[PDB]
Amino acid sequence: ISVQDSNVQSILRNGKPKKARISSIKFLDDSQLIKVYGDDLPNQGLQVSPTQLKKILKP
Amino acid sequence: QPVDVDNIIDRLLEVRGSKPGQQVDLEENEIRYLCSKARSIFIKQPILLELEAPIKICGDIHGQYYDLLRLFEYGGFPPESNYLFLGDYVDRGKQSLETICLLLAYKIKYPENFFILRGNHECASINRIYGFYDECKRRYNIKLWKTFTDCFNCLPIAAIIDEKIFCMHGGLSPDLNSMEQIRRVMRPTDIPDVGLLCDLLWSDPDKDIVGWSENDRGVSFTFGPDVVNRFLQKQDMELICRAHQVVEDGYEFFSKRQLVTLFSAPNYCGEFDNAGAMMSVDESLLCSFQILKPA
Ligand SMILES: [Mn+2]
Ligand SMILES: [Mn+2]
């Protein structure tokens, strides 16, 4: 019922100096790419792959 | 007479655990405050947002408030996670007002860590018809619906995460040559029937076409994988994130992995068995998906 919001730091960069760092995006490997949640599932989520997910969604 | 955004959030969140349907009953002038205060933040912020990671990106909600509360429950409540929502907050679902009021309340509270883009349903001529106007009249009055319209007419239209992920509700435009075209759009504005702003909120990818073709919606166009590939090459970007179409897994890749559709309303309308998804982008630009089963 309470958040730790005394140290929120902006992610809005429009005015700001181009971030000196640069990197290309990457998706996690397929075996860790997805976490599925639900009533049937555990709170912290089940870590599945794309095909594993379709099984859980549509057995 | 002094309005308390913290108190409003507390009250919007009291229905966690309650059966899906329990209304929250904000006062009229509380909702008016959320509209006018959030509208001014939208105007003061750019129309083309430049954001940096970490952030979580979410698609259509359409009034399914209890699914919004689930997204936060698993994704983290603001400001534990940063958020970008891609539009279509209202209509079709039964609790459009709670859904949009929680979003505006978090925009006011965490204005540079919580972001919502405009979808094609954040437009009076659409949400007059598809349910939001009805809900506003039923619970409040016509005037309150016009107050939301003035707020929606100032929403930002797209975002770019760490110069690499370009995000919008609908998709690309055959008129989009330079990002400067988007920055020059003036607000407040309605969504026109044709042109750049229309397309960004209405267009769809089509895996089987080449170039640009008609859209079955009767608005804007469809675009093929070649269009996405060339856009990204020309604009030196790496991923399009968009929403606007239901997808069974809640996320769905396109053009290899150059575009992803995110849709965040599970069991959409009750006539689809889809899950809802949220894409997470971490500090070092590693991307994964959090998926919600229909509850
Ligand atoms: Mn939609
Ligand atoms: Mn849409």
Author numbering:
A (entry chain B): 348 to 406
B (entry chain A): 4 to 298
Quote from the publication:
mRNA 3′ end processing is carried out by the cleavage and polyadenylation factor (CPF in yeast; CPSF in humans). The phosphatase module harbors Ssu72 (SSU72) and Glc7 (the yeast protein phosphatase 1, or PP1). Glc7 dephosphorylates P-Tyr1 of the CTD to elicit transcription termination. We show that the Ref2 subunit of CPF and APT is required for the interaction with both RNA Pol II and Glc7; it acts as a PP1 regulatory subunit, and it likely targets Glc7 phosphatase activity.
To understand the molecular basis of their association, we purified the Glc7-Ref2348–406 complex, but this was refractory to crystallization. Therefore, we made a chimeric protein where the Ref2 fragment is fused to the flexible C-terminal tail of Glc7. We also included two repeats of the RNA Pol II CTD in the chimeric protein with the aim of understanding how the substrate is bound. We crystallized the chimeric protein and determined its structure at 1.85 Å resolution. The structure shows that Ref2 wraps around the back of Glc7, burying a surface area of ∼4,200 Å2. The absence of density for the RNA Pol II CTD in the active site could indicate weak binding affinity, crystal packing constraints, or a requirement for CTD modifications such as phosphorylation or proline isomerization. First, an N-terminal low-complexity region (348–370) of Ref2 buries a surface area of ∼2,000 Å2 through polar and hydrophobic contacts with Glc7 (left). The other two Ref2-Glc7 interactions in the crystal structure are more generally conserved among PP1 regulatory subunits. This includes the non-canonical RVxF motif (SIKF in Ref2), where Ile372 and Phe374 insert into a hydrophobic pocket on Glc7. Finally, the ΦΦ motif that is found in many PP1 regulatory subunits is formed of a pair of hydrophobic residues in Ref2, Val383, and Tyr384 (right). Tyr384 stabilizes the formation of an intermolecular β sheet via a π-π stacking interaction with Tyr77 of Glc7.
